[PDB]
Amino acid sequence: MPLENLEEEGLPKNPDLRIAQLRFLLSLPEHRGDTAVREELMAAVRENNMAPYYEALCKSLDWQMDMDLLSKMKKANEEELKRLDEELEDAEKNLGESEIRDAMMAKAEYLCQIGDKEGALTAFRKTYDKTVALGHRLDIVFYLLRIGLFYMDNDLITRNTEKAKSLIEEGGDWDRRNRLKVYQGLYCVAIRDFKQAAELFLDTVSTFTSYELMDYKTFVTYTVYVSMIALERPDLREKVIKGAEILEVLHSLPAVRQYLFSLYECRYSVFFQSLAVVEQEMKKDWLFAPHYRYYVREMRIHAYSQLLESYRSLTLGYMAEAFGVGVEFIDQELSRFIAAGRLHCKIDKVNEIVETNRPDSKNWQYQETIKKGDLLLNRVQKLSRVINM
């Protein structure tokens, strides 16, 4: 459910339409009692303004904190503090297992709200430790994970998702599995591995019905953006376009649906202006990516690939119009992209052929073998050197 908060963060990250989301972002810490925490979440947003608060500036677009946001925070910590103490007292009276862990979570929330991040993490470990069912242990990891995802600090997210996945078969906490599927996909977007996200998301929709987690419909929409970015058309074709998920929702999909339709129609002018549209509505609406530069390279390389894959020759004009990006730009990107060999092409600009060496040929299979092969020799030498003396 708190997945909305991540959508607020994301849109300002690329500096375009930031203005409205900045305000909406600010409102969430009042409720929570998160004043201090906000500065930390602000960090994730980076490459745009997020600095102004009641305790800071009021000059830039990002929204001022209320006098009320501050006061609510004072209330919340007092109240949290009161709950923690109260919860322990009740624990002495009755069962040890359930009651005590609930108490430690109160302590972690209290430290997490004032801003003592280190303090919150030692407390959170305590929670995990205490003897209760595995099912109950999972419930406690999901809150910290969401919080972790917000800051986009990598370490926190790794730990939680990884243990959470183990427990499912062993406990038999299949019921928890539903929240978890969505949670695995969040992790998967969060590292610079959009590849994983594309396979992960598609699975997530079919196995999900409901058990205390964000709507079904929201995921499907999100599935399309990951699916396209990572996957090439034959994989994409089977999975989403023939598959159930995208069709059932129908509405609220047009940016993404326009992409799939255009790609089917195979008129590349139409696909490229929809690339841009799905980049602005969907892709920038995610905070996710520990280096944004990787996200941009993958969307351009994918679209490029489709155009080049279909044709061994194109005239330069058809290719250049289809992209809609500059001579300077096309060239500038192309030099980086070719090295990888996902494109594997070259531009005969003076006769006007866009030739493709073919990423399905002998030239390709060689490029990979050699590239891996040479580096392996250097490695045998480093191992060999240690062993003799």
Partner: peptide
């Protein structure tokens, strides 16, 4: 070093809308 692609993001979206008309 740092990828020129990032700087390219803002510039590439806008280019697309104009370019298609400008050149065939």
């Amino acid at each position: 070093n740092v990828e020129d692609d990032f700087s390219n993001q803002l510039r590439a979206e806008l280019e697309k809308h104009g370019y298609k008309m400008e050149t065939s």
